[PDB]
Scaffold this active site. Structure first.
Site, PDB file in Angstrom:
ATOM      1  N   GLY A  10       2.128   5.497   9.704  1.00  9.97           N
ATOM      2  CA  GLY A  10       3.558   5.592   9.425  1.00  9.97           C
ATOM      3  C   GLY A  10       4.344   4.388   9.921  1.00  9.97           C
TER       4      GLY A  10
ATOM      5  CB  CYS B  20       2.527   0.393   7.280  1.00 10.51           C
ATOM      6  SG  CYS B  20       0.856   0.676   7.897  1.00 10.51           S
TER       7      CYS B  20
ATOM      8  CG  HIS C 170      -0.605   0.190   2.474  1.00 11.22           C
ATOM      9  ND1 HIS C 170      -0.478  -0.891   3.311  1.00 11.22           N
ATOM     10  CD2 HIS C 170      -0.295   1.314   3.164  1.00 11.22           C
ATOM     11  CE1 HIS C 170      -0.065  -0.412   4.477  1.00 11.22           C
ATOM     12  NE2 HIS C 170       0.073   0.911   4.435  1.00 11.22           N
TER      13      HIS C 170
HETATM   14  C1  LIG Z   1      -3.252   4.004  12.553  1.00 12.11           C
HETATM   15  C2  LIG Z   1      -2.315   2.940  12.079  1.00 12.11           C
HETATM   16  N1  LIG Z   1      -1.707   2.119  12.943  1.00 12.11           N
HETATM   17  N2  LIG Z   1      -1.042   1.222  12.172  1.00 12.11           N
HETATM   18  C3  LIG Z   1      -1.203   1.474  10.871  1.00 12.11           C
HETATM   19  C4  LIG Z   1      -2.013   2.583  10.776  1.00 12.11           C
HETATM   20  C5  LIG Z   1      -2.506   3.233   9.509  1.00 12.11           C
HETATM   21  C6  LIG Z   1      -3.550   2.333   8.892  1.00 12.11           C
HETATM   22  O1  LIG Z   1      -4.435   1.824   9.575  1.00 12.11           O
HETATM   23  N3  LIG Z   1      -3.423   2.136   7.572  1.00 12.11           N
HETATM   24  C7  LIG Z   1      -4.284   1.359   6.779  1.00 12.11           C
HETATM   25  C8  LIG Z   1      -5.666   1.405   6.934  1.00 12.11           C
HETATM   26  C9  LIG Z   1      -6.475   0.601   6.148  1.00 12.11           C
HETATM   27  C10 LIG Z   1      -5.914  -0.257   5.213  1.00 12.11           C
HETATM   28  C11 LIG Z   1      -4.543  -0.283   5.076  1.00 12.11           C
HETATM   29 CL1  LIG Z   1      -3.827  -1.415   3.979  1.00 12.11          CL
HETATM   30  C12 LIG Z   1      -3.715   0.524   5.828  1.00 12.11           C
END
Ligand SMILES: Cc1n[nH]cc1CC(=O)Nc1cccc(Cl)c1
Ligand SMILES: Cc1n[nH]cc1CC(=O)Nc1cccc(Cl)c1
EC number: 3.4.19.12
Lengths: 304, 304
Positions: A143, A145, A41
């Site tokens: 951030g 990820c 993503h």
């Molecule tokens: C708040 C947070 N904590 N850890 C990652 C995040 C950001 C997050 O949720 N990104 C996200 C949301 C939906 C789908 C996908 Cl693939 C990514």
């Protein structure tokens, strides 16, 4: 003595963290040998996240669109490929800090350490469990990820998790290092059912053995139980059914303490039925399920 | 979102760990620049531990009696000196992995990460608090002495603790990096009173703010209190008295959540008086005091 929620030393993993940017999105990547692994993503914009067509989005990107930075130095990307939900960016330089490593798919109920990162830099390390429903209860902000989960055996780092998403419920979901999600999750901004979770029985028993080894024994009683009787109680309390394979795994702790596994099951049965009555075990007022039997033996024996 | 007992990444500290042996005793040392710091009791035998005369014991040792090994390579000792309860072994080689560092003396109630080591090798990392009575509730087995506690700010490691001893009660005691014990403790095998401990009020309040930020808000009530009224309750429940300096430190969290510090005090007062009623806050069934207000802001903001 003493028992803590201990993480593996993170140095070997810190040396693998890099920042990956694609367009406006920045997240973390894991640089091992000449490949950088990151969540796919990174190629999405906010408008794509509702239902990204990853194949089409990736077709618009070239190697030069993936900006990879290891500390203050830029890495040169000479190939890219998508494997499940991860991107693998081939770079022209092998990471000189690559430790001995494996990619493993962990089982629900197993534990691992997470090195939470932002912008390719480490923020902190913590230990957690892969829940029976394949979610993790982490500490991850936007951030984070691309931050990874791992275990170490001597000098070998087994990477088991890459962070991808926080579900609307506030729990976390990710993949193995081949990009396969743990659980039913998809990398898109949608509400997604995690399904019923349960408490990791074999880990609670391991933690009760840890409590006995570390001097907390008030919960030991005069009772015993059977796997069948205990499992009727585990059913009532949303605990995983205990099997002989779990009893076998608890063998070394039963040997060390002299407490038969079914006798510890009877202590757990009484704690489930009566609660703690305002008392604590190893500084906790609840039954802890984030230590495996291997974690307990490793911590109680000082493995390095 | 999510909130974990997070430790600092341990890589910079891992690069400083060495093994120190003197006679039959082996423990850990911390190699920074051309000095190796370790607990002075490395020079004792079991027969000495009841009341060692460290000055006399050290007079029988020469530089060549201190075997210092960094991984698989031996370091050459060209000087030794005892400073309080630590030995400083001058070596002929500066540690090439020496990070930017400071030696600091932390205040009771502050937190730090411990990299537990055995034989100069890291076993794990965990976060803990210096208790108000200057003990630590760690996870340390025999051989862990010389393991260190630290905090990091950007690229600077502030070492605050070196492990020396487990009291007969199972709690831990150690020194700053100048060898001064935290608390009344002495490095000898005797029963030693730790004295009354208390709960770190400002940290419980910080953790309640962390709970609100991370979605756990059931404990917020319609009440407020005053510092005087709250402190009458803190007295009853063995909590440290709250001061305006603590209210000032909680300012940023009060600003972020919109919850006045005295209103959060009234939530804490009700939790102390009524308990949790079988409910949890951030996965805990007790009021957690091992996160400082700085820890909460750092974790909730993703500082690296
Ligand atoms: C708040 C947070 N904590 N850890 C990652 C995040 C950001 C997050 O949720 N990104 C996200 C949301 C939906 C789908 C996908 Cl693939 C990514
Ligand atoms: C069991 C353990 N955990 N962490 C250190 C130890 C060993 C230990 O307690 N050593 C000790 C005991 C008394 C005095 C002195 Cl100076 C040292």
């Amino acid at each position: 003595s003493g028992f803590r929620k201990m993480a593996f030393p993170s140095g070997k993993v810190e040396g693998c963290m890099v920042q990956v940017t694609c367009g406006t999105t920045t997240l973390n990547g894991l640089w091992l040998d000449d490949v950088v692994y990151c969540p796919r993503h990174v190629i999405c914009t906010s408008e794509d996240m509702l239902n990204p067509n990853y194949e089409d989005l990736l077709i618009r990107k070239s190697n030069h669109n993936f900006l990879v930075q290891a500390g203050n130095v830029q890495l040169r990307v000479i190939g890219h490929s998508m494997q499940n939900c991860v991107l693998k960016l081939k770079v022209d330089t092998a990471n000189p800090k690559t430790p001995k490593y494996k990619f493993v798919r962990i089982q629900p109920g197993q534990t691992f350490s997470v090195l939470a990162c932002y912008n390719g830099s480490p923020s902190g390390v913590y230990q957690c469990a892969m829940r029976p429903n394949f979610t993790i209860k982490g500490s991850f902000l936007n951030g984070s990820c691309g931050s990874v989960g791992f275990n170490i055996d001597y000098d070998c780092v087994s990477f088991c998790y890459m962070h991808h998403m926080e579900l609307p419920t506030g729990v976390h979901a990710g993949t193995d290092l081949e990009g396969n999600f743990y659980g039913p999750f998809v990398d898109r901004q949608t509400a997604q059912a995690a399904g019923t979770d349960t408490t990791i029985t074999v880990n609670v028993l391991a933690w009760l053995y840890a409590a006995v080894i570390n001097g907390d024994r008030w919960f030991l009683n005069r009772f015993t139980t059977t796997l069948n009787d205990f499992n009727l109680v585990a059913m009532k309390y949303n605990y995983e059914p205990l099997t002989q394979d779990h009893v076998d795994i608890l063998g070394p702790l039963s040997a060390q303490t002299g407490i038969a596994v079914l006798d510890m099951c009877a202590s757990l049965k009484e704690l489930l039925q009566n609660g703690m009555n305002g008392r604590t075990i190893l500084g906790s007022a609840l039954l802890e399920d984030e230590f495996t039997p291997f974690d307990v033996v490793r911590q109680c024996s000082g493995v390095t």
